[model samples]
Target: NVKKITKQLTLSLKNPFIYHHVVYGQNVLPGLAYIDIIYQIFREHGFSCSELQLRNLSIYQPLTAEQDAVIVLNIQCAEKKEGQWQITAKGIEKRDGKEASEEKLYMKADMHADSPAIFEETLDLSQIKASAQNVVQLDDVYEQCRRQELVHSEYMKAKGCIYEEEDGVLLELSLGSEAMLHAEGFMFHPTLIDGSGVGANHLLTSLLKGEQRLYLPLFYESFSASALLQTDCMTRIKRSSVRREKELIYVTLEFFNASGEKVAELKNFTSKLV
Candidate 1:
């Protein structure tokens, strides 16, 4: 039976970690959480975490949490082809008011059992380190994020060396014990994935020379993780193909582990400046 299976999860604003990922001065859930949740849902339906792959995920709206209000996420998945599942997720905000609530679509993607091949060529970390300019402190980076109204809690912050290369930015991310405390069956933790976006925003701020702007995830054409990232990982964000008119910044990022294995790759990741 290939009928659609729908699963629901209740997200309460009282969850302390939800507020840790803030955007535009509001307690908005991180986009990575949605991806992770979908992956977990697939695991219950006979899918392995390492073999899972997601493609063409478009985020339609932000799921902001208000005090005493809960957001219910409905994840509906069905087999589109042989082994690929088409996933569509919607959220309905419930509050004390008697007003009717409508389910708002947040994201849709396709999940496959087979992941793509890993990168054949190893990344040149030495080259980026040598050519890197604009040395930035981790604390200063978060301060700048504050100016843009994008705030990350202490556990959500990635600590390590950050610098700018000719094409984009590079961050050597090392998770603290606090972050490791909550990995919670995640193929890749929300903090690490979200850290890549934070690094991209940092790149935009540096390129624009201290201009303040809020950027949020729009869509990603393809995402595949060959292996899980370790406690110490690195990310390289390429911004050479950003669109000028739409303020839509396009970037391709790769996640590498301590052993320099390219564990994950994200292609055509578009983040729109708002």
Candidate 2:
């Protein structure tokens, strides 16, 4: 059987991490903010998918601070298909009676999922970071990334992202202090999901332009049977191919966790806005 569930969530500075971070000082909502709500809508419909393969995700505009907006998500096709459940979430922000992310969409994704079950809640930093061996301490990369123009902003150290090397990125959270640390299950702290994605972006831009510029991801879709732990983790980004089009730069990228686990497999994750 197939079905659809429609839901609404009003977003403002009051929303977690809304005013806590910024892309270009726009006070835009971090990717995790949207992830949390995306998951929220899914669970509301009794679907608990750990991973999703997504498409046609167009973020046309950003949810601006100038006004309060309502983020609407319409989830569809949540029935079992071919031995898996298929779920798709469509996100739209209505502010001043217009669509934000005018071209940007897909607050979540199309996925094959798991049914609701028991989830253990834990935020032990050391346990979560058992694989924090290859990466150096936060202090080591702090000043160096800060000194390098793109290094600091690209990885978003201010938002719990760290640069490990030329190709690796570290994601950690101060459990008691960080707002998003409360998320449970293998579904990583929503921030890290977004954090890691941007962390990948950080490495890509460095490899291509070696500077911090306004580049937006046109699409990011990943397929995985494993869910992320709500603990500290790392993402190693490798660029396998690159394309220099008329004006746009596109590339196929891969993401991995410690022990070379295929954390999330991405395809044709392209970036470049202006």
Candidate 3:
């Protein structure tokens, strides 16, 4: 079975992960695609992925691809501690047919089956000045981002992204449909979870809160949110951050449902103002 699974382990078609590769005429793949590939690997192995904590995730090399480039997903699993299974997923570039990591490893991650879910989400939203520009008001801007993300992203238009309201302090998101699952899966698409990363950038930049100097939105790390994000649902996120040691702002996002149920959370997310 393991050998059979290995036969079809590579994904070469265009999806949300590679779509954003050509932002500035560069084929830089988004990091979330690694998570998506891992999620499916777990699913294929009949593993339960509840509140998994993906740690020490680092993209050692930038993935480059043109219109149709072959991408490889490598999975390795081992038992670190009792009841603590570790899953590692890597993205290897096969575009030029060089050794998988010719120069450096494309992307690497370690996911723990169990992770803590309880966190503090007490930040009030009525504190900062909310941005007046929204999807309806700023459709042009969102459209441009979408156009560029034709490969690396699809949850926006697929989930029917509509701006609810926002303050520089809190950001609210509305999904257009509740059944936006992966093209083939029962679990929520990894891109959907990764959308939070985009929301992290959306809220941070929308408020101009990181304008202290220049900012770079580098996704250093994130964890699985506890909240159950359904299709056509409403989600809210509030943030708190201080200055970064590496000129990057550390933003903490607390995601919750309208019922106040804790859905999921991400930490130590790096971002800069545009």
* Window of ten residues with lowest summed lDDT in model 2: 115-124
Total clashing residue pairs per candidate? 0, 12, 19
Ranking by lDDT: 1, 3, 2
Model 1 per-residue lDDT at 84: 85
The alpha-carbon lDDT assigned to residue 160 of candidate 1 equals: 76
Model 2 RMSD vs true structure: 7.0
lDDT of 2 by residue, 1-274 (tens): 2254556555565555555445555555544334445455555665454534333343444554534665554545454554243445455666775666442345444544533222232233344345444544443444443344323222233344443443334454322234334546435454455555555554455455555355545554443324553544544444444444434555443334444444443455555654
What overall lDDT goes with each candidate model? 0.74, 0.46, 0.49
Off by over 4 Å in 3: 1-8, 85-88, 95-104, 115-191, 206-222, 227-235, 242-247, 258-260, 271-274
Candidate 3 lDDT, tens digit per residue, 1-274? 2322331355454644455334445454555455555655656776555646656565554555665666665656555664444554455557644445433345455666665555555433333224434443223334545554423333433343435344332334443342244444534444444455555555555445434343434554766745345442233444444234544566665566655455565567665433
What TM-scores do the predictions have?
0.88, 0.60, 0.64
lDDT (tens digit, per residue) of candidate 1 on 64-166: 8877788888989988777788888898888886442798998898877665446654667776688887777666878878877888886777777677867
Q: Which ten residues in a row have the lowest lDDT in candidate 1?
A: 238-247
Best by TM-score: 1
